[PDB]
Design a binder for this molecule. Structure first.
Ligand SMILES: CC(C)C[C@@H](C(=O)N[C@H](C(=O)O)c1ccccc1)[C@H](O)C(=O)NO
Ligand SMILES: [Mg+2]
Ligand SMILES: [Mg+2]
Ligand SMILES: [Mg+2]
Ligand SMILES: [Mg+2]
Ligand SMILES: [Zn+2]
Length: 889
């Protein structure tokens, strides 16, 4: 197993200047002919010429049109083609090859493969070498001239990067198209697509240059009507990069293509972005609400890569967060502006503090720029993406919008058309910092530790107020726990956005203030503070840290009611729940351990329940925010706070707390459920494909959250409401009716009804599968067996497999059944999937990420399944690397 180290980066001894490809797609094979116009670089030391090439069948290879002899002049071991140096020219030369590949049977969905009746490539990170020989690394920039040929009836639409410069007929029912893309690019941005694609299109005129850009969105014919929202999202994305960043699209055309089989959400190939269908296609009749924000996010993300990833490119894969963290941050600014709802930012924070904080306290913990890797595929992580996005967002918080925009334009102007590293970005921000601080000695050297240091910092507080002096002090400490990456952790540059709330009237007592904590601890003093304030800390979640606010629940309730910042209100509610959860968890755990015949539980704070009611009853308050306050923190957030977490005891703890609150508020929930109906389910714009109302969708989220609370509670006659809800035209509502009917004898009746509604739309059926998978059913193992036998069968579609199994793994009571049967089931699926798709097999490992945080019996059971998986003789390199790291082996 080869380990790549960040510190070992060295430019290649070779240059590839031009790629000329001929890709000939036939029924049983695809023939790839490639000529590489190459040169010797200044770094060359007379080494062998070694190409990446994985699973290629060689027909022939040549240098300067002289055929090379296998064994004497080259060897090939199905991974590397080695041409011995004595046969390599010492100046400009042509390398040519013809290989055979088999997209029909490429179920790993990397390289060139067949998705239903579409041929499509996926080259990031290491898939171009599965198509032809190359030095397959992102600093090998080249020009591409690509011809694709195929059966015309089967494959009438042919696409690759750049301009279509020729189209031609070929004898025997074939045709070809030539695409020339003269600007340099790395090979992972190469793409090709062939199929019977249908489209929608539009023309966009850029803001400044007034260039006409043709926009095309493509899918299979059956679903082409679902493409309209994606086209609107693409127009929105273009406008936002223009408006916020002053950045226009530089090419004549941009194509988006949906395919059914895709390992992730989408890919930013230059001018030819390729999408999982579930992240491009939607309709009001056949999609749940979540599709609309997903498509906005994923179209936005791939569009923003055209600058941050495609125009400014990566030197090497260790810089991945430089394109991903920066592009996720750009998409977050975009979606926040488009949705104009506070729940957009809260949803990103909710994901970070659950999924990413778990990763960062697990054996898999890494910094956003890792020091080493074995498998490139394994470091497309929530750390690199989502913590990287928060590190990219902290520059904006530190600099403010004006100087942030100045520093970003510095980065773009200086690095456009070139490779770059994380240092290049920090340098550009530093130049703006100097400007902002009016101080050419100011620097961001300490900021670089955000790239190199793993683990989540903990930030804690103490306060003091002197009433006679009108002087308030906030004493702040930061600590990062040592881990396997750094024995000694250093203090970070942590920006702490703060307000001070007057508890008598709820008003702001200071203007906008961002504390710059740069030491292990500091004390920030405020004068002319007329009354003791309640501090509003880390507004907007201003650093990706564990916040220990040291506030009383009375203070947190006042912030929840009266603070101006949505994150601090949401966090203050989170913190009240966490205090309760840890207390009741310990009371239940002691009762279990001590085998008590009777014991007491600490009730939920009554003034907190009153504050929830107060907010729920406020007609002026936000529906999406309301849905967060009635929901306990995610299980994966909670687990970061409990050692040896007994999942049964946590399930009992959550049940008690929800029942305490429902026992007081169910009549309120019911009344809101009914009163929200008219606006939440308004059909006025149901047949307007472009009219998308994120507040209305949040009203449905609140209704569907309330209906789940009422259903679990067996609120009187709520089944009537459930049955009526199953008749709604919105899939968010009628799939919710399946979910919440789990508590009633009508479950399988709704199972059949909603299946019939879902079965004729590929993506809707996947959403139905997810709904069944996450159903709170005592017979869920029997239900999953039925899904396997009746619907999933032997599908190799990643969306199918993820839909059936991943939601179930979040079932706290049942996935973690003490027999280990849930662990056994998911391990069987992982090993089965690994035979044909290692990347999706590794995704299916996600529930094991918390293994060493559970109680000791469940730790043992999970570890046993991971060791069983590790002992499979046919295990992929990707799955083996991942499980060796996760098990500290
Ligand atoms: C987060 C993104 C908007 C794009 C990213 C992506 O598709 N992530 C997916 C997602 O996080 O929703 C995904 C990962 C695993 C399994 C299914 C889906 C894509 O790799 C990229 O960076 N494109 O540039
Ligand atoms: Mg092969
Ligand atoms: Mg405009
Ligand atoms: Mg299918
Ligand atoms: Mg380890
Ligand atoms: Zn990306």
């Amino acid at each position: 197993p080869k380990i790549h180290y960040r510190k070992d980066y060295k430019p290649s001894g070779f240059i590839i200047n031009q790629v000329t490809l001929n890709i000939n797609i036939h029924d049983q094979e695809t023939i790839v002919r490639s000529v590489l116009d190459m040169d010797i670089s200044k770094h060359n030391v007379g080494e062998d010429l070694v190409f990446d090439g994985v699973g290629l069948k060689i027909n022939e290879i040549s240098i300067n049109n002289k055929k090379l002899v296998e064994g004497e002049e080259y060897t090939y071991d199905n991974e590397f083609l080695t041409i011995f140096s004595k046969f390599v020219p010492k100046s400009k030369f042509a390398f040519s090859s013809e290989v055979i590949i088999h997209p029909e049977t490429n179920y790993a969905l990397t390289g060139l493969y067949k998705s239903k009746n579409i041929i499509v490539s996926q080259c990031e990170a290491t898939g171009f070498r599965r198509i032809t020989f190359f030095i397959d690394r992102p600093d090998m920039m080249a020009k591409y001239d690509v011809t694709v040929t195929a059966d015309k009836e089967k494959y009438p639409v042919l696409l690759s990067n750049g301009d279509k410069v020729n189209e031609f007929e070929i004898p025997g029912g074939r045709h070809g198209a030539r695409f020339n893309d003269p600007p340099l690019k790395p090979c992972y941005l190469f793409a090709v697509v062939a199929g019977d694609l249908k489209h929608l299109s539009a023309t966009y005129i850029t803001k400044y240059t007034k260039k006409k850009v043709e926009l095309y969105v493509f899918s299979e014919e059956k679903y082409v009507s679902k493409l309209q929202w994606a086209l609107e999202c693409l127009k929105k994305s273009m406008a936002f990069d223009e408006d916020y960043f002053g950045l226009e699209y530089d090419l004549s055309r941009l194509n988006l293509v949906a395919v059914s089989d895709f390992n992730v959400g989408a890919m930013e190939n230059k001018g030819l972005n390729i999408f999982n269908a579930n992240s491009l296609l939607a309709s009001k009749k056949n999609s749940i609400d979540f599709s609309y924000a997903r498509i906005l996010t994923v179209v936005g993300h791939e569009y923003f890569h055209q600058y941050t990833g495609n125009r400014v490119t990566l030197r090497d894969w260790f810089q991945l967060t430089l394109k991903e963290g920066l592009t996720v941050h750009r998409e977050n600014l975009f979606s926040e502006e488009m949705t104009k709802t506070v729940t957009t930012r809260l949803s990103h924070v909710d994901l970070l503090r659950s999924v990413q904080f778990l990763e960062d306290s697990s054996p898999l913990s890494h910094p956003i720029r890792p020091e080493s890797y074995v498998s490139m595929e394994n470091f497309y992580t929530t750390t690199v993406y989502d913590k990287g996005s928060e590190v990219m967002r902290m520059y904006l918080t530190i600099l403010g919008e004006e100087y942030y925009k100045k520093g970003f334009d510095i980065y773009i102007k200086k690095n456009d058309g070139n490779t770059a590293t994380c240092e290049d970005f920090n340098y550009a921000m530093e130049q703006a910092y100097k400007m902002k601080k009016a101080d050419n000695s100011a620097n961001l050297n300490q900021y670089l530790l955000w790239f190199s240091q793993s683990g989540t910092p903990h930030v804690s507080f103490k306060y003091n107020y002197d009433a006679e002096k009108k002087q308030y002090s906030i004493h702040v400490n930061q600590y990062t726990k040592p881990d396997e990456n750094q024995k000694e952790k250093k203090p970070l540059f942590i920006p702490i956005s703060v307000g001070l709330i007057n508890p008598e009237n709820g008003k702001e007592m200071i203007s906008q203030t961002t504390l710059e904590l740069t030491k292990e601890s500091d004390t920030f003093v405020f004068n002319n503070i007329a009354v003791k304030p309640i501090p509003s800390l880390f507004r907007g979640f201003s650093a990706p840290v564990y916040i220990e606010d040291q506030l009383t629940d009375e203070e947190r309730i006042l912030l929840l009611k009266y603070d101006s910042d949505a994150f601090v209100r949401y966090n203050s509610c989170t913190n009240i729940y966490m205090k309760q959860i840890l207390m009741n968890y310990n009371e239940f755990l002691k009762a279990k351990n001590e085998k008590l015949e009777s014991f007491q539980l600490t009730p939920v704070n009554a003034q907190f329940i009153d504050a929830i009611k107060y907010l729920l009853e406020d007609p002026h308050a936000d529906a999406g925010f309301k849905s967060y306050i009635v929901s306990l923190p995610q299980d994966r957030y909670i687990i970061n706070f409990v050692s040896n977490l007994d999942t049964d005891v946590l399930a009992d703890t959550k049940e008690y707390i929800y029942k305490q609150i429902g026992d007081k508020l169910n009549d309120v929930y019911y009344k809101m459920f009914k009163s929200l109906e008219a606006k939440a389910d308004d059909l006025t714009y149901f047949n307007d494909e472009s009219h998308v109302d994120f507040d209305q969708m949040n009203m449905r989220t609140l209704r569907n959250t309330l209906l789940s609370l009422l259903s679990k509670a067996q609120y009187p006659n709520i089944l009537n409401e459930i049955i009526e809800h199953s008749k709604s035209p919105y899939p968010s509502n009628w799939l919710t009716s399946l979910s919440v009917s789990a508590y009633f004898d009508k479950y399988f009746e709704l199972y059949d009804k909603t299946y019939k509604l879902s079965k004729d739309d590929e993506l809707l059926l996947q959403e139905w599968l997810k709904t069944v998978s996450r159903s709170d059913r005592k017979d869920i193992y029997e239900i999953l067996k039925k899904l396997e036998n009746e619907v999933l069968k032997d599908s190799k579609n990643p969306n199918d497999i993820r839909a059936v199994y991943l939601p179930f793994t979040n079932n706290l009571r049942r996935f973690h059944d003490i027999s280990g049967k849930g662990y056994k089931l998911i391990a069987e699926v992982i090993t089965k999937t690994d035979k044909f798709n290692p990347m999706v097999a590794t995704q299916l490992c996600e529930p094991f990420k918390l293994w060493n945080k559970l109680d000791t019996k469940r730790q043992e059971l999970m570890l046993n399944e991971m060791n069983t998986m590790l002992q499979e003789p046919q295990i992929s390199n990707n799955l083996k690397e991942y499980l060796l790291r996760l098990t500290n082996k």
